[PDB]
Symmetry: D3
Subunit: 303 residues, 6 copies
């Protein structure tokens, strides 16, 4: 039968059927949105990212047959579990609802995809992976986000991984790639290193990408956390706090593809996208493709 | 339980459940989108209107308890039948698919709501009502849209009602309110008058609204066609061809309310909304409300 | 000597000298900003309003000599106390800081001007007026904002006056003008009415403005709360939740002028402006003028 | 044969043939642009107005057959003399080039149409009408623009008519309609009244439009000067310094229409349009139409 | 003699004299616009590209004297034949109108420059080159555009070269450079390879540009087709369907420069530019320069 | 205790205290804005750059502790001297106002930072350095700006350094890096070479950046002039006249860092930023950071 053009149809992620987090369904991949952006400290807009990503994903409906004739995501079913129902304010309640929804979705799919939302959502999201032994996180970001307190709060988008580690003893390591900028929280850097976390500055990527890939985990259970500001602002300008000289789409994708080829991917989140800050719409289009391309890599080599 | 905020959840019209035009369902109201805008002769964008209206409708989820404490649309069921699957180009095929979908939706609901799309969609939509005796159309528009041929085509957005009339002998009358502008197709005006159609210039609405309401049909089968450019550009700037000094939201709504109170409404379409032309977003927010408020009025007088 | 054009100089409200809330200063009028917008339920952006209003106020630097040759605000001194230092999240802490800064500013000026920020800021702002006998609030708004709980929180922008009344036994009456829309919280409306509050729908303003002015308070201590969405979206589109058919600038100004002529004005807040939602910039330009014109009226009838 | 749609073809005013100011041609109406905006004191952008107006005029190509079947501008020839070649800075030189071009275009048409550009262009433009006996100017504007010196200059957009009067003893009277705002130059107002100029505040138009029309000249040589900020900012937001509660399109047109039918119109300029400040594009669309409708009125009452 | 600044004068390509496609003129280079965008399957806007390109070209008026002091395009004459008069809808009629205009312009100049318009215009454009022996096409694009049918039509922007080949046996070869993305039409790829077409993925350009240049045709009659989406979205965001990691301006220009110095260039089109999708305006400014620089290279190697 | 988030507080550069140019203060670094943009020859907007840069600088408040734990600008004091009070038009008066303000600021700080404004401001700015022996200028720009006359004026943004040199024989040498484009003023290029100025095209940076750095001055009094269009438009699109293939932020910074490491930096200006042309806001965010990072380098190598 005829198929909808991108501007047609209800926008669900990858045009997947809609389901409830605690419903009776099962799928290889399931998306869950978290339209929460009140924890960021600059320009809001990320609450609109889940919807923008769903809309942009209509340009990337699986499966995909590449130029070389190979087809990826063949036989991979999808589901869109909608969005976590968030309260106004009440960060603690929002966190609990996010964790509960993430748990339910995780228990019904193989690889859950979480659409943020500012980076603070990664904390309650990760609480749903408490039973993953030696859980590792691979984070693309211009910022470390391992701060204890910022602007008198423990729940800002600058503390998700610090909060996650103190709540999850199974989260044994984090590899962050793309760090750059004039300012870094010394207490956060010290705390991350003290825990053996791997910090890879964007300088490393530029000088030797081959080496960066060489620093990625091997044979581990990995959770992907992609902060769109890890990418160069010229490529992805739609984000609150841009920092120059970031990852090209290709570099960020190469890092994700490599990690997904040598590890067991247990989930992925895409955060800090701000559609309202990029009127060209390329930010949401490229990031929706990023999620889909990452999934291609994952399922094209799973154990 | 908790409810989503406007920015949360999958955007279906009025958050109604998604169904297939020819699926096994029944509801009081059913929405059907027609993301077609290649027939307009100026600024494109109406193809994105159905999606924009669905998103905006999340701010107007029924039922409604007003300031006076009374509730409207209580117990009235809704369904979103998605969008007509349109081809690229191929206007004739597009028309056939639009009529087929509209027919299927019509047979399954009491009042169908069509989301355009440029005004040319009203022609194939009306074909789905060829069985309605003495069908009257109440049209809000700055333009008459009764032209025979324009820029070498019979299918432009300036010809929907002319096409509809020649194909539907049961379409016995059209009442158009809000006409204004420097240019009018003399052949179209003459043709409309000859068929006994009622033409109500905006100047008459400004001069005496009560008089205009008295010119509306009474005890007839009515199809509403709302071209957003009938409203003043200051109120609704998101449209291809704006004309100064149009209807305020209140005036247009009073006309729809009056007609809905004195006739049997068989359907309604909302066309020419161009979200891309109004970065403030008020155009879609207000027009989504207009559709919902019109339904409140329609169901307040169900015989 | 030469004076800056609007685009020159540091933007302080009315180009007034900068001071600290608890510093050693005194002035007739003092402005204080509250860049808080995490309590609204739709489109963010009001956190940028204080800055936008300051920039726009450079087009309205006092005193003003009108067409008739008469001068207003002559000799009236101004000061800009900057903004309340807000934390991230932590609504309760934010409230405490807002109340403290407001108290300090209030103690050093005759009429304090508060620039929001979403409407939730009116609650902590009003707490600074606990010592004002029989405090009356005159609120311009499309919404009532007298809700107890909304989306699982007590601190949303829909509850500021409910929170204020429970924290301030001296807040004996509220007059709200401009209400309109398909939905209202029935408990909020009934509670407000049962408390003796005056609700004036926009319909009444349109029907008989004189009658509305006659309903305003007289010989009372009055605090002005101006929610920009009380104004018609065509005039002021830059706001989160617009509702059609609102106050023209002239109508809103007549209401404020009337109240200022017959009462002791103790303060005023300007909330819900979202500069990011109006690329024409007219929203902040017109609202900055409203504040300045309101002050002209206040000081013209001060007792 | 076939005609271009608005988005097709080279944009010349009213789609008229292109000519040189000092070329060998003759026409009833001739357009001349003056992309000069370095004299305004706030938001630039008017330098692009001539081009925006030409593009917008493609929606208003003459002649016009209205709803009544009557045609206007039938047989009336048009020409586009392009723009004055302006230097960078060098206001004195720009003025001389403007006057020379205006003189040349004036000598080759019956009614010249000048597209600004900020209002300062009206001065060198008026210098080309030194031989018109008892010249009268009908100015639509929110401001008076009769200031002697502003920000240390004699050539700002606040001084065009003051400069014109001192250079043209034949300019015997000016009628300005639409004045509003909190500030007016007391010296400028006094100077205007001393010369017998007529000042009609927007309040007068609102209170009694009939009384306003009665103050317009009769049987005089009239030059129209339309500053788009005379119109309400909700209608025409694309302008540097908007002032609330202005003329609706209809009111401004009624004033121009009355004056056009009772006098010998020798010219007209349209200034202060800032396309860049109105992403909806309604400002240029409506103002291009304003010019064409004014012309319809002019040639509809030729002696 | 004084010359207009970019914002002055009537916008004709390269500020060249305006002429009719069938008029009495002759020039080395002639531009023809094709404001047709109803064939694309995503975001419209390309219909405004011809006009945007003309305006942007005022920043690149020939001749050009570089930093080395050498002058290019010296003595080369230009002309702007306006735009093809397109009907509404009626793709077949549009195609015929396009081919006829292309033929007329082709016979009055040496190198015709066609401004699109979506890519589907290349088909009717190429039909005007049926008499060119062993015609080779050098295509810059992220997409192949050799698809047979898409969304029930043979005339989408994904089929221009497929339609051109089955209609022009003299079209013996196509070299496409810049291909990338997750999805490629296997049937289209197979059909292209079966005809011996050269497919050069962006990866090859990145890996070895010298190798890519060595693959370009030599001593052949070449038609250049430049789809702006061949360039990286960071550089040229103004396009309907962007794909990450594309050609830099320099890389695309190097390809065109090399092909221009070793072949007989018979024409060039610039398609898919969507000015409405890039509010920074760099897309049209850079692409206008691309056409002009390509022309510099072309006439520096004419035999 | 707590500190403002970027959206909070009065926007002064680096959140530094506000002072008067001739006031009684002293600071290591002092900022002065020059909101002048009437000299550029294309798209206006730079007049708003000083304000945009100040706002953006709130994201770069000193001192800075990098990822390595080292802190820069520790103890370095800052001040914001506001903006030069500019007249409307009257370029010569503007120039004198600028030179005097710059001299006053220079005598109260070690390193003055000047915020433009179009590039023409560099001329009056440099006059404030008439007392510096063997003054060298390091200019990042896509254009040379050594033109004598352009569009009939001596004061355009294409002549700042030409004017500066003839007024300042002590300005012995200029090193311009980043030059590119199709057109260059041969007269300007010759005059610069004759004075021995070093011209470094962007191609040289791309080929061998190390070789470019080796060409920078050593042990000299250096004034930095950064024209944002020197950077690639993909990175910094907010500028009047962009040119493809420019400096990455990293490259521009490397050039500035190199010169600051072994020269006595006497001042720096940042010109041609046009915030209105980049709705993503990255242009001002990155350029504010550039200024701050340059200062970090400067004070890391003080003699
Ligand atoms: N790590 C401190 C700053 C992190 C900000 C988070 C995401 N933008
Ligand atoms: N009736 C001729 C013009 C109609 C245009 C249709 C809708 N914009
Ligand atoms: N009174 C309930 C809704 C109020 C919203 C507040 C302001 N927008
Ligand atoms: N009459 C003083 C102000 C005039 C400004 C001119 C036009 N905006
Ligand atoms: N080749 C199939 C897709 C082509 C789209 C055309 C231009 N964007
Ligand atoms: N050097 C001639 C052009 C310079 C323009 C200046 C800055 N944009
Ligand atoms: Mn992060
Ligand atoms: Mn980050
Ligand atoms: Mn219409
Ligand atoms: Mn219509
Ligand atoms: Mn409110
Ligand atoms: Mn409100
Ligand atoms: Mn004015
Ligand atoms: Mn004026
Ligand atoms: Mn393509
Ligand atoms: Mn293509
Ligand atoms: Mn430059
Ligand atoms: Mn420069």
């Amino acid at each position: 039968g005829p198929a909808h053009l991108p501007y047609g149809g209800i926008p669900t992620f990858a045009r997947a059927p809609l389901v409830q987090p605690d419903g009776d369904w099962q799928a290889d991949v399931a998306a869950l949105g978290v339209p929460f952006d009140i924890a960021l400290g600059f320009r809001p807009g990320a609450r609109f990212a889940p919807r923008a990503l769903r809309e942009a994903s209509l340009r990337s409906v699986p499966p995909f047959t590449g130029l070389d004739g190979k087809t990826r995501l063949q036989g991979v079913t999808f589901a869109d579990a909608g969005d976590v129902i968030l309260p106004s304010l009440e960060p603690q309640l929002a966190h609990d609802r996010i964790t509960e929804a993430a748990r339910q979705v995780r228990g019904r799919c193989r690889v859950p995809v979480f659409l943020g939302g500012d980076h603070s959502v990664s904390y309650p999201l990760l609480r749903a992976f408490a039973d993953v032994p030696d859980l590792h996180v691979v984070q693309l970001d211009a910022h470390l986000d391992f701060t204890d307190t910022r602007n008198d709060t423990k729940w800002s988008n600058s503390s998700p991984f610090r909060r996650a580690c103190e709540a999850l003893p199974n989260l044994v390591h984090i590899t962050t790639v793309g760090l750059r900028g004039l300012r870094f929280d010394p207490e956060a850097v010290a705390a991350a290193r003290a825990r053996g976390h791997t910090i890879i500055p964007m300088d490393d990527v530029t000088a030797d990408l081959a080496g960066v890939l060489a620093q990625l985990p091997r044979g581990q259970n990995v959770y992907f956390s992609v902060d769109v500001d890890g990418f160069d602002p010229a490529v992805i300008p739609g984000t609150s706090s841009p920092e120059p000289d970031g990852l090209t789409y290709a570099q960020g994708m190469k890092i994700l593809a490599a990690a997904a080829a040598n590890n067991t991917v247990v989930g992925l989140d895409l955060v800090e996208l701000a559609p309202n800050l990029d009127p060209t719409g390329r930010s949401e289009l490229l990031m929706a493709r990023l999620v889909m391309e990452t999934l291609c890599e994952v399922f094209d080599h799973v154990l």
